[PDB]
Design a protein around this ligand. Sequence first.
Ligand SMILES: *[C@@H]1O[C@H](CO)[C@@H](O[C@@H]2O[C@H](CO)[C@@H](O[C@@H]3O[C@H](CO[C@H]4O[C@H](CO)[C@@H](O)[C@H](O)[C@@H]4O)[C@@H](O)[C@H](O[C@H]4O[C@H](CO)[C@@H](O)[C@H](O)[C@@H]4O)[C@@H]3O)[C@H](O)[C@H]2NC(C)=O)[C@H](O)[C@H]1NC(C)=O
Ligand SMILES: *[C@@H]1O[C@H](CO)[C@@H](O[C@@H]2O[C@H](CO)[C@@H](O)[C@H](O)[C@H]2NC(C)=O)[C@H](O)[C@H]1NC(C)=O
Ligand SMILES: *[C@@H]1O[C@H](CO)[C@@H](O[C@@H]2O[C@H](CO)[C@@H](O)[C@H](O)[C@H]2NC(C)=O)[C@H](O)[C@H]1NC(C)=O
Ligand SMILES: *[C@@H]1O[C@H](CO)[C@@H](O[C@@H]2O[C@H](CO)[C@@H](O)[C@H](O)[C@H]2NC(C)=O)[C@H](O)[C@H]1NC(C)=O
Ligand SMILES: *[C@@H]1O[C@H](CO)[C@@H](O[C@@H]2O[C@H](CO)[C@@H](O)[C@H](O)[C@H]2NC(C)=O)[C@H](O)[C@H]1NC(C)=O
Ligand SMILES: *[C@@H]1O[C@H](CO)[C@@H](O[C@@H]2O[C@H](CO)[C@@H](O)[C@H](O)[C@H]2NC(C)=O)[C@H](O)[C@H]1NC(C)=O
Ligand SMILES: *[C@@H]1O[C@H](CO)[C@@H](O[C@@H]2O[C@H](CO)[C@@H](O)[C@H](O)[C@H]2NC(C)=O)[C@H](O)[C@H]1NC(C)=O
Ligand SMILES: *[C@@H]1O[C@H](CO)[C@@H](O[C@@H]2O[C@H](CO)[C@@H](O)[C@H](O)[C@H]2NC(C)=O)[C@H](O)[C@H]1NC(C)=O
Ligand SMILES: *[C@@H]1O[C@H](CO)[C@@H](O[C@@H]2O[C@H](CO)[C@@H](O)[C@H](O)[C@H]2NC(C)=O)[C@H](O)[C@H]1NC(C)=O
Ligand SMILES: *[C@@H]1O[C@H](CO)[C@@H](O)[C@H](O)[C@H]1NC(C)=O
Ligand SMILES: *[C@@H]1O[C@H](CO)[C@@H](O)[C@H](O)[C@H]1NC(C)=O
Ligand SMILES: *[C@@H]1O[C@H](CO)[C@@H](O)[C@H](O)[C@H]1NC(C)=O
Ligand SMILES: *[C@@H]1O[C@H](CO)[C@@H](O)[C@H](O)[C@H]1NC(C)=O
Ligand SMILES: *[C@@H]1O[C@H](CO)[C@@H](O)[C@H](O)[C@H]1NC(C)=O
Ligand SMILES: *[C@@H]1O[C@H](CO)[C@@H](O)[C@H](O)[C@H]1NC(C)=O
Lengths: 435, 435, 435, 124, 124, 124
Amino acid sequence: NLWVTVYYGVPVWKDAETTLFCASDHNVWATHCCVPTDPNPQEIHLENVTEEFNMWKNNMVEQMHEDIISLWDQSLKPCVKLTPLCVTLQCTNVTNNITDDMRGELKNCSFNMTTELRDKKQKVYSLFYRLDVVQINKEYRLINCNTSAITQACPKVSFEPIPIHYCAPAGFAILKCKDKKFNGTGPCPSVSTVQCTHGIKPVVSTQLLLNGSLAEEEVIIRSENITNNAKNILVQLNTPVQINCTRPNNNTVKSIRIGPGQWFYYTGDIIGDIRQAHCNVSKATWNETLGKVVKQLRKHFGNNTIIRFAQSSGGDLEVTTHSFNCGGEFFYCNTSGLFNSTWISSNDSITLPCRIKQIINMWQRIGQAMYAPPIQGVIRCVSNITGLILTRDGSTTETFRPGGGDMRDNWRSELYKYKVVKIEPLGVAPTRCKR
Amino acid sequence: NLWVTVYYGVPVWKDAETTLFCASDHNVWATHCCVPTDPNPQEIHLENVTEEFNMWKNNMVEQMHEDIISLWDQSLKPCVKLTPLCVTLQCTNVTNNITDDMRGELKNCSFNMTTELRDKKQKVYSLFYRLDVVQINKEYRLINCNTSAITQACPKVSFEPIPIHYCAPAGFAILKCKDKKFNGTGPCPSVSTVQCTHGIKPVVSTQLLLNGSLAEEEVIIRSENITNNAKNILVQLNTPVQINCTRPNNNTVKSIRIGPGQWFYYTGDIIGDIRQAHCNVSKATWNETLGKVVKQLRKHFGNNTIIRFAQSSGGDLEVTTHSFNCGGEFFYCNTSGLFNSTWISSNDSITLPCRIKQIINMWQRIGQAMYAPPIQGVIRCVSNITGLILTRDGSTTETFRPGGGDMRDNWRSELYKYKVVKIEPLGVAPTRCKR
Amino acid sequence: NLWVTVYYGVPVWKDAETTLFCASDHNVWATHCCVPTDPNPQEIHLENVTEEFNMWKNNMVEQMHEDIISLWDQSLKPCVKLTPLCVTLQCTNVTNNITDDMRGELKNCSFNMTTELRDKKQKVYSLFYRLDVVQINKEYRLINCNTSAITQACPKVSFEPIPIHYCAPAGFAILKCKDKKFNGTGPCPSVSTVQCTHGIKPVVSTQLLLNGSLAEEEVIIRSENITNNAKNILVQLNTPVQINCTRPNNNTVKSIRIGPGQWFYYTGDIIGDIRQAHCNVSKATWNETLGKVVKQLRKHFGNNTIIRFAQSSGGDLEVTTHSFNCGGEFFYCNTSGLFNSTWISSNDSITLPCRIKQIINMWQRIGQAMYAPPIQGVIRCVSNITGLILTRDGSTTETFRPGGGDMRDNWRSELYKYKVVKIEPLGVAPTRCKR
Amino acid sequence: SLGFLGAAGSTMGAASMTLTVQARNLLSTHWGIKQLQARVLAVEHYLRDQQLLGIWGCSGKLICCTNVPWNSSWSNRNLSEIWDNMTWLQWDKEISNYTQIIYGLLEESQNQQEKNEQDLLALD
Amino acid sequence: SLGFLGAAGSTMGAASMTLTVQARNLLSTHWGIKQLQARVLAVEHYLRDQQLLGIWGCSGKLICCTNVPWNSSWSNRNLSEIWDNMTWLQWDKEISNYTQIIYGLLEESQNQQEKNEQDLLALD
Amino acid sequence: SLGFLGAAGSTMGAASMTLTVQARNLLSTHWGIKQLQARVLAVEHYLRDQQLLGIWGCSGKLICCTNVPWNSSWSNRNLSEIWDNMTWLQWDKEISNYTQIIYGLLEESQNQQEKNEQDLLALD
Ligand SMILES: *[C@@H]1O[C@H](CO)[C@@H](O[C@@H]2O[C@H](CO)[C@@H](O[C@@H]3O[C@H](CO[C@H]4O[C@H](CO)[C@@H](O)[C@H](O)[C@@H]4O)[C@@H](O)[C@H](O[C@H]4O[C@H](CO)[C@@H](O)[C@H](O)[C@@H]4O)[C@@H]3O)[C@H](O)[C@H]2NC(C)=O)[C@H](O)[C@H]1NC(C)=O
Ligand SMILES: *[C@@H]1O[C@H](CO)[C@@H](O[C@@H]2O[C@H](CO)[C@@H](O)[C@H](O)[C@H]2NC(C)=O)[C@H](O)[C@H]1NC(C)=O
Ligand SMILES: *[C@@H]1O[C@H](CO)[C@@H](O[C@@H]2O[C@H](CO)[C@@H](O)[C@H](O)[C@H]2NC(C)=O)[C@H](O)[C@H]1NC(C)=O
Ligand SMILES: *[C@@H]1O[C@H](CO)[C@@H](O[C@@H]2O[C@H](CO)[C@@H](O)[C@H](O)[C@H]2NC(C)=O)[C@H](O)[C@H]1NC(C)=O
Ligand SMILES: *[C@@H]1O[C@H](CO)[C@@H](O[C@@H]2O[C@H](CO)[C@@H](O)[C@H](O)[C@H]2NC(C)=O)[C@H](O)[C@H]1NC(C)=O
Ligand SMILES: *[C@@H]1O[C@H](CO)[C@@H](O[C@@H]2O[C@H](CO)[C@@H](O)[C@H](O)[C@H]2NC(C)=O)[C@H](O)[C@H]1NC(C)=O
Ligand SMILES: *[C@@H]1O[C@H](CO)[C@@H](O[C@@H]2O[C@H](CO)[C@@H](O)[C@H](O)[C@H]2NC(C)=O)[C@H](O)[C@H]1NC(C)=O
Ligand SMILES: *[C@@H]1O[C@H](CO)[C@@H](O[C@@H]2O[C@H](CO)[C@@H](O)[C@H](O)[C@H]2NC(C)=O)[C@H](O)[C@H]1NC(C)=O
Ligand SMILES: *[C@@H]1O[C@H](CO)[C@@H](O[C@@H]2O[C@H](CO)[C@@H](O)[C@H](O)[C@H]2NC(C)=O)[C@H](O)[C@H]1NC(C)=O
Ligand SMILES: *[C@@H]1O[C@H](CO)[C@@H](O)[C@H](O)[C@H]1NC(C)=O
Ligand SMILES: *[C@@H]1O[C@H](CO)[C@@H](O)[C@H](O)[C@H]1NC(C)=O
Ligand SMILES: *[C@@H]1O[C@H](CO)[C@@H](O)[C@H](O)[C@H]1NC(C)=O
Ligand SMILES: *[C@@H]1O[C@H](CO)[C@@H](O)[C@H](O)[C@H]1NC(C)=O
Ligand SMILES: *[C@@H]1O[C@H](CO)[C@@H](O)[C@H](O)[C@H]1NC(C)=O
Ligand SMILES: *[C@@H]1O[C@H](CO)[C@@H](O)[C@H](O)[C@H]1NC(C)=O
């Protein structure tokens, strides 16, 4: 005695994969390409809706990866090509004001490079940081000469992260997980619907995550499979750890024409003493932070067991040391003073030595190299450590080491709260109404 | 006891901005980017409709400006690059057939040019006009060597303007002002609706507008604010002034290969006397034209005010000197002979001397330079002056001078009749009908 | 007393021209740009429907041609440019182990090539096939260093034809002719509707059509106008003829770096003796095939005539010989042994000598030259002749020659059964109801 | 039991029962442009047909009976000669010269119908 | 007719006689993107207006009467004043403030009507 | 009220009064292509559902009662269980296996109804 009744505008949805667009709010993220945001966004709480989230199968991460790389490459399209620099360099050591920490790190190179006119050359003198120069046999070449084309980054374009809001297209919605102590893979008892995400800054780093969100109550340890030693562990911190990084040298930056309409920037000289770049982390804060991490790890690995921290086992510098963009310079900072402790159930800082490199190969690609022009003056930056990337060695003692290098993990950490669903407004149910 | 009635198809609209497309009517203004026009375009007169127009805030102008630049740049994309020419030139003077009008206006330069094969060179000589060559310290270089890349315009692509009609998308309409003697900013008592504008030739010039529309009855003086000396005055003539321009030299054009698939064009030599380029206008026509302008200009200044004309005070050649594209050559003509008079309450022409420049930097941009290949033989063109661009000096006898340098003014001159509105077919009103 | 009734969803159509898209099924063409096909495609037979088809006015062919050229060009965009090879080569022909078939068909050339560093040069020795090397005045250059510029094809990308399905957009459908012995221009008594064509392999060839479809019962001769000597004749075979092609020379391939991330590939030397490339066609099969062709030609020219086959009258190698891609190698085979017979009303093979060419100007274009990297080892391929391209000459004897090219006639041999129509679902008819 | 256009060639009467089959199959690097143009065009054609049905007052129906009488000048056949002995392809060709007359009349008829209804409701 | 928007300037009670005319004109390398955006935009606007009518309960109608009473606070006129001595451009300005109020009432009324219809149909 | 999907999780009965809220929020440098593709999908979806409503005879309604009886084999439940103790997400999952069957039946019913209407008008 029941009849089919059709309803349109039914509040249901399905998991779906669609293309999201950016909304933002000169720079390397080409934010002028985004649709400006709504000053008064809404969040609609969904009472009595429990949804399954899975941060590891989330394709929002894959899109963020594809767009960050694409934006990055587009920003270099109009920039000066440095092909003329792949010449033999004649290099000697910088020895005039050295503290012996930087023994051999800087090199004073000279070379024959072109001028505005094709029939004329000029002799150029410049400084290199050793990591970016390789010996040929005092004859050197740049490291990119046998693998890639080199492009100078445009000096007018900032690399500072700008928050990006991702927005679902009409017909789709983004569900956000509001639960505290949520590890990213289980059911989420409290959710809400938003059209656009929290702005996410595309901060790029390895080993330790910088300037992200904080855990609401306690350190949260997230992994695809915690017992699989091959997986990375993303640890979100409850409170930030402050880190102060610097390149404590007053650099004089010079530039020359290399061809019509094009100029090259290089470090001319250094004023005063030459000192090693470094980062400062407070010891007490760092030791408390690890204690919190260890407690949470014991919940998975045992109270009657031992947790030991150790340095990355080895591999490429881009993976094994900490890396970040500070003022536009690229830093490679050792983490050995951060992960050297065995945990068994003071106004002082940890000083981390750092290296500087001018030739950069991002996103783990080969054939596309970028030259970061040097910055005049002295650079200092302060940032918050908001999470860690750890791996585990394959007894009673477990060893954890810094890991990462796969950029999708940094994003994944920020996007863990969101999933995209398709709205399916049309459906049927039996009623007593017939016609 | 009235009820709401909903009506759809209601003939109302709002001011709006949108994307317009071209309908046209081997060429820089590619028609490959357009659709055909209707053979029978429609126009609808609107009785009892008065609209507000403001030509100074008309976004059709901004959009036309951007389309033209984009078409221009695309036309050079596949053309021969001339980087190999930026070498030291060995130059002497062309003194062979000089009347002293052209003394110093031509140089005879030799250089070591590239060839099809990488391992070969050729010695080439060519002529330059001084304006495009700068002395290095008889050692010269092209003017673009220290600022821009130079691209040769394709010899097969015409710079002759094709009138382009602009068309609104469905849902939008263009209202046109039919009020004769309309100054562009007030209410327009007589309007009509069209879907496409008349075709507008994208003529490029400064100071004197060429080949535009004429005022229906009287000279019309239009300005954003007539008392603001920071604004230009656009004067639309009700009669054309004929101007006859020439480059009275028989050029022999030479061509060489510069690399695989590429060739460079240049003037080899000149047959006969070397003469200065020039333009002629009738003295009587020009003096009558100014008298009409002055009579109308006085409406905003008084009959106790003396109106004086003077030459531009200075600045770059592209602004102070009249310019246009004639036969494919770029002319820079001196208008001081036209604007030199004070106005107080038969077979005799005015000759304006002109210079020719081969390296072109349009839209006042730096970094994109075009090389205009030579035109073989002798050039003559005839055109109509349809309006003037004037500026006014900062306690009696107001002085006016030729203006320009901003192309949006030429477009505003043609696009003062049209505005874009969005059609809004849905609305409500009270009736005696309910259900 | 009849009334108009409107029906929607009416099964009618009109002939139409729309844009079709590719649907797929390390390739040169971007197969990744296509959408995967329907796992279970449908075909609907239309009973009692006769439609007119015209293979010579079919716009599907024109799109296929355009798409293939564009896809091809896309594949070379990221590949190494070989501009630095346009130097004088010093050559002395290889004469180490020859049979006098290859005398003068190979050349041992040396040149000064660039290196990663701009400061260095390297001497390179390589072998060329003569067709690609032209004497300059022992001084030679590559043939395509004046009219063009050369791009090296990427060695990892395959030229093997991959069948591509074409699919109509919603609102359009493709009518497929299923009529045995259909000549391409008349009414087709039995048709069906499909959304996608079968996949068609983009096989590129001249003289003979390789790896296509076969006629159901008899050889079918199709032409736009059989009496017009300006038109080509497409002959579809009902049986394949097997052809075995080879380059029986074991090449040693070497490579050098030519720049920062760029490398050039070339033949270093030959292991063993030097032998000519050739193709084998069985005599009995080929003679049976021609007999069938002749019978079908008599039906159009008379049953009391003489049909004579002859080789090409002359012209460029690309149109006088049988061009095909074998293993990625480019062959130019002589068909004079196939078309030399007058027809009047046990492992014995025909050997066709073939030449090899590395610099290829595809699609009868000028300015875009491709360099085909050498293939290490020995090449053998076996393919099916599925049709012939013939031309007819201006007595009692009709003379036919192989005719090829235009890269539209080859496609027409597969795209002759398909027509695109627009669905027109709305219409009216008289009936009995009113309101 | 027929697929898309499987009724083509059948009589108009028989084909009128598959209208749903055709209707439901409507809508159903330069490459990005080709896909967008294909999608956009399919939508534009769909919407123009729907707008026209809307104007005529047939927006929700596959078979819509209107108030415009049939003129023998368009076609003077018997209803059998049309519905039992012709297919839709043939019919469309036979009356292709009256299409815009019929469509204009349909627009006028519906506009008159809407006005009459609005006034009756206002009346009482 | 007067052609597209030719009725503008005419009083409301006269302009409304030719609504069809403005309905048919709602659907009638960047170069390709500018054109796709223009085409997509026209469709989006068309559909948004059509959805409002559908929500309010009007489907293919150019003129539809609802059950929402007119408030004198929105506009206090002699009715003949509006239909005989005012044009649509003027009217649209006069009540532009109340646009959202009226639209909200139209949605509410129809939602109530649909529920009421469902209950009555269930009765038997 | 609750701006969008606010009723999700409420019972099916309670949520029936927010159909308007969800319906009105539907359809509301190569980064230009991604934006066009998204805008086009917003139109293709939506427009596709409108077609189904059209075919089923529900073109102008948020709530549409048809003449197809409910089969207990799709779901053997008390109406009070369905409307008071379940939400729409749960319901849709329980009968997601029968959706195609129901949709096919709805199309058949409407087609039969249009033919029957045409014959009655012809007889009247
Ligand atoms: C008409 O139709 C025929 C039949 O389809 C085509 O003939 C085929 O052409 C393809 C492409 O040239 C051939 O594929 C190649 O085979 C090589 C040999 O591999 C076979 O033989 C070895 C013997 O030791 C076996 O171990 C092996 O399993 C195979 O059975 C491969 O070496 C080739 O791969 C190399 O090149 C590709 C890029 O193209 C790289 O990606 C690989 O890594 C590798 O370097 C390739 O697979 C196929 O064998 C041919 N079939 C026959 C029967 O001969 C005709 O080409 C076609 N005519 C025209 C004009 O298109
Ligand atoms: C320039 O710097 C290099 C290091 O980059 C110095 O090389 C080292 O020299 C010491 C002393 O002889 C050796 O013990 C190290 O093993 C060398 N290092 C490497 C990597 O080989 C070099 O001596 C310095 N030159 C000058 C003049 O100071
Ligand atoms: C994150 O929390 C979820 C629970 O919300 C954990 O999922 C359970 O894992 C066990 C294995 O230890 C399975 O037997 C259960 O069936 C899972 N339950 C659910 C609801 O999925 C998950 O393991 C936790 N992950 C981490 C890294 O803490
Ligand atoms: C163009 O005409 C308008 C009138 O239609 C002029 O604008 C008026 O200027 C007076 C002052 O002289 C003001 O008091 C009025 O309020 C203005 N009216 C309007 C509608 O703006 C305008 O100045 C004229 N401009 C030119 C260049 O002639
Ligand atoms: C039109 O131009 C006149 C200048 O002639 C502007 O008048 C000046 O406005 C500023 C700012 O209020 C005052 O400080 C000056 O004293 C005014 N000058 C005179 C002579 O009165 C006028 O504001 C401009 N009008 C518009 C609409 O832009
Ligand atoms: C393909 O077959 C059709 C018949 O179906 C041929 O068409 C006829 O051509 C003659 C030419 O003298 C015309 O007079 C007839 O009126 C045509 N008949 C029809 C039905 O169109 C066609 O010429 C044949 N083409 C080839 C290449 O064989
Ligand atoms: C097919 O080609 C023949 C030519 O081979 C065309 O016939 C010629 O038509 C012109 C114009 O009427 C006559 O002056 C010639 O004398 C004809 N030549 C012969 C040999 O008959 C024929 O018209 C073409 N068919 C079609 C359909 O275009
Ligand atoms: C524009 O306004 C005039 C009035 O000024 C309208 O003309 C009147 O139309 C009515 C109705 O047909 C006649 O009774 C009057 O006698 C006309 N008056 C005059 C002075 O002619 C005219 O119709 C309006 N135009 C439009 C398009 O609505
Ligand atoms: C979420 O579930 C709770 C529990 O069933 C709902 O709470 C009921 O709300 C009604 C209406 O206000 C009250 O009469 C009942 O007494 C409440 N039940 C209880 C146990 O307190 C709540 O309304 C649901 N949320 C939504 C959005 O539907
Ligand atoms: C520049 O070239 C000259 C060539 O004679 C060479 O002697 C000199 O060492 C080169 N200079 C540098 C810094 O390489
Ligand atoms: C070309 O190069 C040679 C190098 O020896 C130089 O002497 C000659 O002056 C150059 N010619 C020109 C025109 O610059
Ligand atoms: C390479 O350059 C030298 C320069 O002295 C020249 O003698 C030699 O012939 C060149 N080699 C070739 C193969 O042309
Ligand atoms: C190739 O030539 C060498 C040198 O004469 C000879 O030793 C070798 O046997 C030859 N190979 C063949 C296959 O003839
Ligand atoms: C084709 O005609 C036959 C009668 O000869 C008829 O039975 C059949 O149904 C027709 N085909 C179609 C698709 O209507
Ligand atoms: C109800 O569903 C069952 C199972 O699919 C089917 O066998 C039965 O015929 C259906 N009832 C009716 C009236 O069709």
